[PDB]
Design an enzyme around this catalytic site. Structure first.
Site, PDB file in Angstrom:
ATOM      1  N   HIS B  30       0.815  -1.207   0.000  1.00  0.00           N
ATOM      2  CA  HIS B  30       0.000   0.000   0.000  1.00  0.00           C
ATOM      3  C   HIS B  30       0.852   1.262   0.000  1.00  0.00           C
ATOM      4  CE1 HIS B  30       0.670  -0.759   4.320  1.00  0.00           C
ATOM      5  NE2 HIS B  30       0.495   0.538   4.496  1.00  0.00           N
ATOM      6  N   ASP B  52      -0.405  -8.084   0.851  1.00  0.00           N
ATOM      7  CA  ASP B  52      -0.169  -6.641   0.567  1.00  0.00           C
ATOM      8  C   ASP B  52       1.288  -6.328   0.917  1.00  0.00           C
ATOM      9  OD1 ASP B  52      -0.410  -3.590   0.695  1.00  0.00           O
ATOM     10  OD2 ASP B  52      -2.491  -4.116   0.218  1.00  0.00           O
ATOM     11  N   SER B 104       4.155   2.391   8.741  1.00  0.00           N
ATOM     12  CA  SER B 104       3.975   1.056   8.198  1.00  0.00           C
ATOM     13  C   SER B 104       5.309   0.368   7.954  1.00  0.00           C
ATOM     14  CB  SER B 104       3.176   1.123   6.901  1.00  0.00           C
ATOM     15  OG  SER B 104       1.831   1.477   7.161  1.00  0.00           O
TER      16      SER B 104
END
Lengths: 48, 153
Positions: B30, B52, B104
């Protein structure tokens, strides 16, 4: 000629068998591919 | 953390962190950006949509010096860049307001300095912040823990 020529019958059964085999092989293959995709989806859902 | 954890840049802004675990690099999908280390910029990143995240095999020099994953997760408190992160009921949370966008890919650390999960996103639940994170399992199973309303950081 005493009879008209049709299409649905004017094709030899041997030729029909070959044609059906070569047309049904791909259909069976795509069916197997969809089956494998569904099985993979069930496995990945179960093992998440 | 500091030695083996590389930010991803974008226009000069960090928008995530990449981690080299078990001899392989991982980055989340992402986030979009440029990896800081040039040597890892040439790694072809095999993509795993379900996770992901993209993974790649690090070169010889750096394959010796990597973080180790772990499977065993004794419930309780766990280390993180922003302090101690809390684990109960098969869910990772943090005191609310800790962590946010651009965090992240920061690994979750344990007592012996081994990785147990990688943070991917969060849901702010008011009292705390539910963290959508990928984890290991006893059966050697990789699982993407994602609470309801997960926001990919």
């Amino acid at each position: 000629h005493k009879v008209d020529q049709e299409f649905q019958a004017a094709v030899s059964k041997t030729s029909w068998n070959w044609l059906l085999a070569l047309f049904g092989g791909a259909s069976s293959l795509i069916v197997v591919g969809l089956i494998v995709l569904v099985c993979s989806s069930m496995l990945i859902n179960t093992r998440r | 953390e500091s030695d083996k954890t590389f930010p991803i840049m974008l226009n000069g802004q960090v928008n995530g962190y990449a981690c080299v675990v078990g001899g392989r690099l991982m980055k989340p999908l992402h986030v979009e950006g440029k990896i800081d280390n040039e040597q890892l910029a040439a790694v072809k990143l095999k993509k795993a949509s379900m996770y992901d995240l993209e993974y790649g095999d690090v070169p010889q020099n750096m394959k010796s010096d990597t973080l180790q994953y772990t499977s065993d997760k004794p419930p309780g408190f766990y280390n993180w860049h922003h302090g101690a992160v809390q684990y109960e009921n098969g869910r990772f949370t943090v005191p609310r307001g800790v962590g946010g966008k651009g965090d992240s890919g920061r690994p979750i650390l344990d007592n012996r300095g081994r990785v147990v999960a990688i943070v991917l996103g969060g849901a702010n639940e008011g009292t705390r912040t539910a963290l959508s994170v990928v984890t290991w399992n006893q059966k050697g199973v990789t699982i993407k823990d994602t609470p309801e309303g997960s926001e990919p950081w």
